[PDB]
Amino acid sequence: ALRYPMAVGLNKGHKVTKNVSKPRHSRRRGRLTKHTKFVRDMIREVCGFAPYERRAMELLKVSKDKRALKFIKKRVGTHIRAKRKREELSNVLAAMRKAAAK
Amino acid sequence: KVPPAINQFTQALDRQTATQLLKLAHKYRPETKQEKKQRLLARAEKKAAGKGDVPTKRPPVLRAGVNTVTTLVENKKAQLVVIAHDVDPIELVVFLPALCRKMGVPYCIIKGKARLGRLVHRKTCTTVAFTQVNSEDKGALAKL
Amino acid sequence: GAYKYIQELWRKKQSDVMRFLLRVRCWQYRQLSALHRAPRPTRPDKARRLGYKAKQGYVIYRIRVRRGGRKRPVPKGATYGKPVHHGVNQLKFARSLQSVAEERAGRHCGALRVLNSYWVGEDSTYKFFEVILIDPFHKAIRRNPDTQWITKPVHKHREMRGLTSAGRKSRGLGKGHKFHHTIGGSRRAAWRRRNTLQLHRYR
Amino acid sequence: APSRNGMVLKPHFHKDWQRRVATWFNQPARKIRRRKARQAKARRIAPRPASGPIRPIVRCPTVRYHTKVRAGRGFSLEELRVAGIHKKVARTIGISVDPRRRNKSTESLQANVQRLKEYRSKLILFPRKPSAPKKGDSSAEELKLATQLTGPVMPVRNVYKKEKARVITEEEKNFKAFASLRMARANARLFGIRAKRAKEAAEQDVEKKK
RNA sequence: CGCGACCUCAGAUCAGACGUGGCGACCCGCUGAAUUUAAGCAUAUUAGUCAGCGGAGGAGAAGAAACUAACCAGGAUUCCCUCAGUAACGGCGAGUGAACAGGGAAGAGCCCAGCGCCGAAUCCCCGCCCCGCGGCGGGGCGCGGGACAUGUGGCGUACGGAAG
RNA sequence: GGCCCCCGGCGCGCCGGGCCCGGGUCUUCCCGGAGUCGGGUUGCUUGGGAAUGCAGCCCAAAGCGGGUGGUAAACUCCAUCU
Ligand SMILES: [Mg+2]
Ligand SMILES: [Mg+2]
Ligand SMILES: [Mg+2]
Ligand SMILES: [Mg+2]
Ligand SMILES: [Mg+2]
Ligand SMILES: [Mg+2]
Ligand SMILES: [Mg+2]
Ligand SMILES: [Mg+2]
Ligand SMILES: [Mg+2]
Ligand SMILES: [Mg+2]
Ligand SMILES: [Mg+2]
Ligand SMILES: [Mg+2]
Ligand SMILES: [Mg+2]
Ligand SMILES: [Mg+2]
């Protein structure tokens, strides 16, 4: 025939019909719920911020974003975790900026 | 330097107000073991002859316990929350003033977890919450 | 739902409120003895997460351990041998300090069973842990299924055989490619299997 | 010392091996003890199959063994759900279940539901109280038809679809098997770099005129 | 300005229980050499072994995936055969050295915390009565004590669960 | 093969009491373990090799997150577990 199943190539593999199904409930782990988000927001305004988080906000306030990321990565430890933390710290700065605007 | 989350529990109710609050709260104490037995036996006697189920309007009662009160505040079901000022592991109630204010339920801080315990026939209670109240005490609860 | 708030609160150990509480408590624990019974769990949510229940038979012991590594206990630093074994300082104990605190609680209270432990504070020179113990002969413990397992003879001194959560972490147990050292139950179990010469009857 | 030609040998006998030597003089005794336990277990579960629960049809993982099929740990919940068996009742009637096994394809799914439906048809169920047969089975098909089953229940067997000889068409004769394999390997190897070069060329194309 | 509640502590030859020490072939947690080999020797090897300390049971430990894989996918632990003296480590020297898949022995799965709902529904102790003794339980009673809302019990646990 | 004595677990009728509703469909809700993970460094350990595991010290999390995917790193998709 023109084309055959192959053990190599971009479309390699034995051909089976894929069984589509709902993902397992363990794969749901880590999703943020409405109540858990509410609790974490409660604790954040009760507690505040860690001293390194406040320092990183000063760097973001003067728009030293590369230096802020270097500082956060040195504190938290990894690039992926630092990028997520920097976005959140940028978000709270923007949130309190528009709160003080009105 | 005590952070305001911990310093807020030093502001307790004055003696006059705490007296009106506990005097009202005396009318809604949870039923003891003895009078629950008396009530349950009466239900058994009445069910035997001859009314039947007879819910008979489960009366308003003072809800107690930090886990119970927290859910009531989160559901906006509490009308008034009373927090003891001397919870020794002070993490059980540090969020409650902020949580109550966020949910709009009025809250006060009172002197003595032992006084709250006597309300519920126990040694100690962190918090008690006022749910719906009898009509003759709606005026009193509103003033508080 | 208050336990959820306390859990999120204790995840903020560097906040102003938690920094104050941890410092004051660490000062207070410094004034007490190294081994000391606590009237109640300091962290009730963390305790019950680890197996504790507020009923008779469960007791709490606060343990204070000294921080740092393990100096080799040789006279004048002389470890007579090859230079690879000359190390005296910068040596580290195989078991964590939490496992040591559990062992000290269990040794003192030999009639109780160590269940778990958790962190309540630390200094530059001390770490403080609270250990959950169970009285195996109290009727509340003994008449309850789902708790009767701790009453068995095989479960005595778990903290000394590395069977508690803290003591288990140093044994290198686990599933998959990172934990090939302990296939068979332990390092010794794996080592004996891999170093035994199987001489069959028919070779 | 080496002596003339020979193989460079590396014995692993430098580690006090004689303290850990496993002799096998209890091998014949071990086989007797295992046989006795098997026979005692079979007697204990008197009409139930001696080998145990039915096992699913399962393909072997890697590329070395994926042509073979064997018995798995237990039936997946997706298989039981479409076969109409409760996941908690299945273990009572001799069906092994594996809650952590997934079904990636439908062929393996449907292969195992015919296995469950075949087993369920061949199952003789005794009533809990023999004097009160509620919904299990008739007494006729369990008075004498009940017999302990020896060997695995419905043993998993590799099957081959025999192809009859056919006339080779011209399209099959013109197919280039070696050339296709060589080109398929090249296409998979250069797929990522071909896209990047096309992407870079597209960037130059959308601004080439200015 | 004494009397109460709680908290945190203390004493008792208080009522009732429990631990200690031995054995230690097998098992678990640590600590841990040097002889030796390298034709010297220091890394390496001996060896995570001897010695040392602690803790168990009739077995122990492990154990129901923060797994293996990359397949058309398998599916807790433990043991045997094989993988394999292999991948790898190594003054890349002497030497050391697993795992996956496959075939078997055996095969068994579950429980909390948390989120919630249920008038704390929960548990221990002490007196009284009856049925029993043989490892001390069953039932009933006590406006009898205590624990416990700083959280007991029932439902329920990632395979989803609850309520209509 | 016989006789004697003792002990233990198997079905039936009864006894004393407990014992409380299961599945499918739809709808509305609810879902998780923190000085822990992870990172740096140090020492030991491993076949684990730009670091397999364990531990001390310092830093110190997130929630479409986290871990793993045997070469360090950035971006991207996927797989797998929790
Ligand atoms: Mg050496
Ligand atoms: Mg006495
Ligand atoms: Mg002993
Ligand atoms: Mg030599
Ligand atoms: Mg020599
Ligand atoms: Mg020894
Ligand atoms: Mg065991
Ligand atoms: Mg275990
Ligand atoms: Mg699981
Ligand atoms: Mg070979
Ligand atoms: Mg070695
Ligand atoms: Mg078998
Ligand atoms: Mg509960
Ligand atoms: Mg790579």
Short mmCIF file of C-alpha atoms (C1' of nucleotides) in Angstrom, two decimals, chain A residues 3-16, chain D residues 183-185 187-188 191, chain E residues 71-72:
data_model
loop_
_atom_site.label_atom_id
_atom_site.label_comp_id
_atom_site.label_asym_id
_atom_site.label_seq_id
_atom_site.Cartn_x
_atom_site.Cartn_y
_atom_site.Cartn_z
CA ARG A 3 1.68 3.96 3.69
CA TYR A 4 2.16 1.35 6.41
CA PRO A 5 2.44 1.57 10.19
CA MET A 6 6.08 1.95 11.15
CA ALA A 7 8.24 1.54 14.21
CA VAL A 8 10.00 4.81 13.29
CA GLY A 9 9.05 8.26 12.07
CA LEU A 10 6.81 11.06 13.21
CA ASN A 11 3.73 8.80 13.21
CA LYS A 12 5.39 5.69 14.61
CA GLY A 13 3.54 3.16 16.70
CA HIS A 14 0.93 0.45 16.56
CA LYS A 15 -2.46 1.92 15.71
CA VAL A 16 -5.13 1.70 18.41
CA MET D 183 13.06 8.81 5.01
CA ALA D 184 10.85 8.33 8.07
CA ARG D 185 13.93 8.37 10.30
CA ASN D 187 11.77 13.27 8.85
CA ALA D 188 11.56 12.62 12.58
CA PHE D 191 11.27 17.94 12.05
"C1'" C E 71 5.01 0.73 24.96
"C1'" C E 72 -0.64 -1.40 21.31
#
